[PDB]
Amino acid sequence: NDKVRFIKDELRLLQEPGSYVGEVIKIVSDKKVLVKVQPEGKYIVDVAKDI
Amino acid sequence: GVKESDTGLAPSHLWDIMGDRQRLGEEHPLQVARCTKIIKKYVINLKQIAKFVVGLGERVSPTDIEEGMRVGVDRSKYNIELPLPPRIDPSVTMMTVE
Amino acid sequence: DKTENDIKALQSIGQLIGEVMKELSEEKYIVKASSGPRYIVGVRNSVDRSKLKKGVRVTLDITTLTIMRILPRETDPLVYNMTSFEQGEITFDGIGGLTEQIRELREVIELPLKNPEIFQRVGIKPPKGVLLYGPPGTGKTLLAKAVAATIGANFIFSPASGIVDKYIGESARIIREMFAYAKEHEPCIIFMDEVDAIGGRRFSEGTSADREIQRTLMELLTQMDGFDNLGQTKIIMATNRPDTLDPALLRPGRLDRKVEIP
Amino acid sequence: NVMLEKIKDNKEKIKNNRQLPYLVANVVEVMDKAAVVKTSSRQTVFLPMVGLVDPDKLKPNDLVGVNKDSYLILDTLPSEF
Amino acid sequence: ALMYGPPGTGKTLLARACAAQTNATFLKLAAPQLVQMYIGEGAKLVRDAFALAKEKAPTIIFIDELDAIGTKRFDSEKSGDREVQRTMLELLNQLDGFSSDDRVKVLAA
Amino acid sequence: RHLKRELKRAQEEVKRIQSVPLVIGQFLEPIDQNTGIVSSTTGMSYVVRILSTLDRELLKPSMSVALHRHSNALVDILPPDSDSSISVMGENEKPDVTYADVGGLDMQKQEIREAVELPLVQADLYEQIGIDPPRGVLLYGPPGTGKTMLVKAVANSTKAAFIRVNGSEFVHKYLGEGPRMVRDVFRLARENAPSIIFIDEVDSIATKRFDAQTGSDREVQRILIELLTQMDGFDQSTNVKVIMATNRADTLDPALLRPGRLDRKIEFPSLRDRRERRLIFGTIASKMSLAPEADLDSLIIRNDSLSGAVIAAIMQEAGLRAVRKNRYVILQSDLEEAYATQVKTDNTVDKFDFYK
Ligand SMILES: Nc1ncnc2c1ncn2[C@@H]1O[C@H](COP(=O)(O)OP(=O)(O)OP(=O)(O)O)[C@@H](O)[C@H]1O
Ligand SMILES: Nc1ncnc2c1ncn2[C@@H]1O[C@H](COP(=O)(O)OP(=O)(O)OP(=O)(O)O)[C@@H](O)[C@H]1O
Ligand SMILES: [Mg+2]
Ligand SMILES: [Mg+2]
């Protein structure tokens, strides 16, 4: 059953918003992190609430 | 609060309502480009390197658009809006205006 | 007919050009696009699967990225300006006083084009690569000009410093085309003037400007003779003074004849 | 009377498409009737050229405008430096 | 033509008179502006200047202080610059006959 | 039992996402069996879910992969041999030179046969005796001694795949494409192993000094880091490492010549003694038609320095001059004239002979 519930619902998961890889340059005390996506510049962006 | 603060938190309350009117208006963003040839029409070059032939803005006379000049163009269909003061080197020689 | 031709013309739309990088299957090929991203594309039922193989250049619908038709090979715009040059004719006795150097140049260029049977008799591999050098103003360009309007072979004319570009390695792509163009239309001649610009000494301690030159020079060495030998392609250098040319280029064998014009 | 009305009606539809702004390109080669242009957005398109803009005018590298919405050779541009 | 001599005799002045009187196209150029730090952007400028001169023909190109395109006498194995060199040799190919040198006169000072 | 049939039928449906068009990525490295890291050929990295029931054994070693354009999902895999810019020559482009056309340099022939040939045919010998196998081979020498021509001969005999790249194929114009060329070239060798990689001239890529400010330099540094990284990965394959030549030795990056990467250094001399000179004259002259009056022994004494490429030119010149006289054979008059031209070697005692 784990298989067939997964195959049918898999098509809706594969319309992904994608993902990126950065690297922590430095943090700040607003809970935000400066990370660099390598080809482009750097971005200050916040963590999800859970981590 | 002391997060996303950079002011005395007293004139920034009023500034908060003023920035909502500027965000709705398209004074910005204006993508900064430069003219390469005036065609009696202009030949504009964007920084992301792709060239365009544009028209004219309702803001400005054609008398003020000059050779090589820096000009701001629309975010969308590129049209000349505002002439800008020239020179991008000023960042060492501007530091020595005493 | 012309103003109705615009209405019908607006129904057509551009097609992103690529080239077949490698046949995966008979249904789907891999094409590399001129924009950049490699794709896996479909085929039309009209197009012969036997002409679609590695190297041929195709075009694509921008709607689906499916192969619309085969295209012949296309000559870069730089290499078209180099063939454009040469206008009118200059007589070949109109160069005079140097009648001996004209004959030693024909021993390399005229002879192995017509009669490679004579060089086959002795058993010697034909000479290629001629270096013209002498005091400035002696006529080293005049000699090349007259002989390129006369002989009738395809003729690329190239100012040595005119093929440098700002963008990284774009200067590398040009020199490869000139040899690819020449290898195709053969028999052909490539003539380069004032080759101190890119035949400069070794260096490797100077700036980044010097390091880019080192990359086109390294390439030009392996294009004349590496694994693959030129065919009926002949290469003529002209220089003001041979002393400031890199020793790997000047070298006997790479440029066989070193004609001094006094 | 009908020939004068044809050239005014088709010209209202040419003027709608000629609308500014429009991308710039140059012509890497005329197949010769086809133009392969290399646009200033650094890609390449093949197309059956607009028969109004002659193959005679076009010589490799010369500047041409191109309609940005759909790649057609809209006009010929003056050479500039 | 070339103008050479001691500073202050009026080589620049004399060219200025010629510009206003002949009502030919006068393309002022300065030899250090031509030299450029990008790799090969200085060569592209020479060819564009003579190509513009064909359209407006006939023309006069007045070059100032040709010492910024200096002299070719280096060949060291340690550095050597070889930038000023490249744009000077591009200038010689436009002075040659392939490029029409009969519509374009050159005043060098 | 009825659910085993529907799992098949419901699995045909995810397989139908694979369609024209696709954009090509390259599987960089795993992090899970339901997620991995790809690097598109657009220049962007992505972290995307893998499609169920795909080979998890073949993804891990760097391989090309297919993405779906409008999400970058990894919908299926491509073969390891495919998506290679530069493919194995040899079909009929293999050069005509052989060990027979080559002359002297007998020491060098033996070294390189021991460096390249013997490891492929017999890996066992090296392990038994307990010597470390010579891995990468380097060729230095002053221009024109027959570095490349000794490698042509080796392309014929081996009967192992052969990948031939100039040093300027690696400099790209767009972005990250330099790193993308190296990654392909080493995988392609491992795939059709055993295999020889040859970079004609690697000198410009292996330079010693970087400004690290200009864009051009910052892009070469990436190509040079990748080469060094995958040079140690090559170990414990049947593959013999990259064999590469440079006519310069002072400009090389010494990070290549550390041990565990390039190990064996071949020398090609410029100096020719009298025995080794006659050997080169012998092979060029046996192909050509000469009078029996002409003799090579007259030549060898005059010059005390000469190299295999200057000799090549002299024979061309004597055989080009024979055409002006209209002589089938190279007569000893032509041979002598041609000797005195394309030698020189006088800059130091030319008019300064009073130093003795
Ligand atoms: N041997 C010659 N016979 C007749 N005229 C000559 C001769 N040599 C040069 N000239 C004259 O010189 C003009 C140009 O000379 P040319 O450009 O060939 O010199 P160059 O050696 O190419 O110069 P550079 O070293 O700058 O390349 C010719 O148009 C011609 O009038
Ligand atoms: N031992 C030899 N026997 C026969 N011919 C030789 C020998 N050495 C050199 N030659 C001849 O000299 C030519 C030049 O050799 P090659 O081009 O391989 O030199 P190279 O070391 O690659 O020089 P570069 O520094 O330009 O790469 C060869 O093609 C060959 O004809
Ligand atoms: Mg002055
Ligand atoms: Mg070699």
SS3 of F29-76: EECCCCEEEEEECCCCEEEEEECCCCCCCCCCCCEEEEECCCCCCECE
Q: How far is CA D54 from CA D28, D40, D57, D61, D79, in A?
A: 16, 22, 6, 15, 17
Q: How far is CA D61 from CA C75, D54, D75, E74, F132, in A?
A: 12, 15, 15, 37, 58
Q: Is C77:D59 a contact under the CB 8 Å cutoff?
A: no
Give Cα C4 distance to the centre of its chain.
42
Give Cα C216 distance to the centre of its chain.
13
Angstrom distance (rounded) from CA F243 to CA F234: 13
Question: C90-105 as b/e, with b when 16 or more CB fall inside 10 Å?
Answer: beeeebeebeebeeeb
DSSP class of residue C229 equals B
Angstrom distance (rounded) from CA C23 to CA C39: 12
Q: Is C102:C139 a contact under the CB 8 Å cutoff?
A: no
Residues of D in contact with B57 (CB under 8 A): none
Residues D79, E48: C-beta atoms closer than 8 Å: no
Q: How many CB atoms are closer than 10 A to CB A12?
A: 7
Give the 3-state secondary structure percentages of chain D, helix then strand then coil, rounded to 5. Answer: 20, 30, 50
What type of residue sits at position E99? S
Q: First and final CA of chain F: distance in angstroms?
A: 102
List the 146-165 stretch of F: residues with Cβ below 8 A of A: none
Ligand at minimal distance from the CA of E96 is 1
Q: Is F140:F267 a contact under the CB 8 Å cutoff?
A: yes
Residues of C in contact with E78 (CB under 8 A): 203, 205
Residues D68, B50: C-beta atoms closer than 8 Å: no
| Site from C6, C35, C81, C170 to mutate, D interface, most D CB atoms within 10 angstroms | C6
Q: Is C212:C171 a contact under the CB 8 Å cutoff?
A: yes
Bond from prior residue into F30 cis (ω within 30 degrees of 0): no
Q: First and final CA of chain A: distance in angstroms?
A: 32
What radius of gyration do chain F's Cα atoms show? Answer: 27
Q: Is the CB of C138 under 6 A from ligand 1?
A: yes
Give the 3-state secondary structure percentages of chain A, helix then strand then coil, rounded to 5. Answer: 25, 25, 50
Residues, chain C, total? 262
List helix spans (H) across chain D.
Answer: 2-17
Nearest in space to F86 (alpha carbons), one of D16, B61, E37, C54 = C54
Q: How far is CA F137 from CA A5, D43, F140, F177, F246, in A?
A: 56, 41, 10, 26, 11
Angstrom distance (rounded) from CA F38 to CA F25: 6
Angstrom distance (rounded) from CA F89 to CA F109: 23
Spatial CB neighbours of B27, under 8 Å, sequence gap ≥ 6? none
Return the ∠ at Cα E65 (arms to E59 and E68), rounded to 5°: 110
Task: List the structure tokens of F68.
Answer: 């779906």
What are residue D48's DSSP bridge partners? D34
Residues of F in contact with A35 (CB under 8 A): none
Spatial CB neighbours of F99, under 8 Å, sequence gap ≥ 6? F109, F153, F157
| Site from B38, B47, B53 to mutate, D interface, most D CB atoms within 10 angstroms | B53
DSSP class of residue C48 equals -
- Residue F74's Cβ-side half-sphere holds a number of Cα atoms within 13 Å equal to 32
Resolution (A): 4.1
**Mutate which of F108, F109, F148 to test ligand 2's pocket (most atoms within 8 Å of Cβ)?**
F148
Q: Is E24:E58 a contact under the CB 8 Å cutoff?
A: yes
Q: How far is CA F308 from CA B26, F269, F280, F331, in A?
A: 74, 10, 7, 22
Ligand at minimal distance from the CA of E5 is 3
E42 is in an annotated binding site: no
State the sign of the Cα–Cα–Cα–Cα dihedral C133, C138, C142, C143.
negative
Task: List the structure tokens of C112.
Answer: 């192995």
Q: Is the CB of E18 under 6 A from ligand 1?
A: no
In the sheet that E104-108 helps form, which strands lie side by side, from edge to edge?
A: E25-30, E59-64, E104-108
What radius of gyration do chain C's Cα atoms show? Answer: 23
Angstrom distance (rounded) from CA F293 to CA F296: 10
Angstrom distance (rounded) from CA F91 to CA F235: 28
What are residue A39's DSSP bridge partners? none
Say yes or no: C61 contacts chain E, CB-CB below 8 A.
no
Angstrom distance (rounded) from CA F317 to CA C124: 10
What type of residue sits at position F257? L
Phi-psi region of F13 (alpha: psi -120 to 50; beta: other; left: phi over 0): alpha
Return the ∠ at Cα E35 (arms to E32 and E37), rounded to 5°: 125
Residues A20, F48: C-beta atoms closer than 8 Å: no
What type of residue sits at position F161? A
Pick the atom of ligand 1 nearest to C238's CA: 27
Q: Is F172:C169 a contact under the CB 8 Å cutoff?
A: yes
Q: Is E59:E104 a contact under the CB 8 Å cutoff?
A: yes
Pocket of ligand 2 (CB under 6 A): C 221, 225, 248, 253; F 102-105, 143-149, 247, 280, 283, 308-309, 312
Spatial CB neighbours of F127, under 8 Å, sequence gap ≥ 6? none
Q: DSSP for B55-88?
A: ---TTS-GGG--TT-EEEE-SSS--EEEE----S
Angstrom distance (rounded) from CA E33 to CA E30: 6
Nearest in space to C105 (alpha carbons), one of F335, F343, F320, F330 = F320
Q: Is C157:C191 a contact under the CB 8 Å cutoff?
A: yes
Phi, psi angle pair for F351, to nearest 5°: -120, 10
Ligand at minimal distance from the CA of C90 is 1
Write down the number of H helices and E strands in chain B. Answer: 1, 5
- Residue F126's Cβ-side half-sphere holds a number of Cα atoms within 13 Å equal to 16
Helix (H, G, I), strand (E, B) or coil at C260: strand
Helix (H, G, I), strand (E, B) or coil at B38: strand
Nearest to F319 among C21, C22, C124 (CB): C124
DSSP class of residue C162 equals G
Task: List the structure tokens of F255.
Answer: 């990070």
In this structure, the dihedral spanned by the alpha carbons of residues F14, C36, C228 and F157, taken in order and rounded to 10 degrees, is: -30
Q: Is F324:C108 a contact under the CB 8 Å cutoff?
A: no
Q: Is the CB of C141 under 6 A from ligand 1?
A: yes
State the sign of the Cα–Cα–Cα–Cα dihedral E90, E91, E96, E102.
positive
Angstrom distance (rounded) from CA F90 to CA F86: 13
Q: How far is CA C227 from CA B79, C187, C222, D60, F115, in A?
A: 54, 20, 8, 34, 21
Question: D13 CA to chain B: closest CA distance, Å?
Answer: 19
Angstrom distance (rounded) from CA B78 to CA A22: 33
Binding site, annotated residues of C for ATP: 134-141
Residues D71, C9: C-beta atoms closer than 8 Å: no
Phi, psi angle pair for F247, to nearest 5°: -85, -5
Report every protein residue that has its C-beta within 5 angstroms of ion ligand 4.
F 148
Say yes or no: C243 contacts chain E, CB-CB below 8 A.
yes
Nearest in space to D49 (alpha carbons), one of D57, D41, F184, F180 = D57
Task: List the structure tokens of D13.
Answer: 């539809």
What type of residue sits at position F263? D
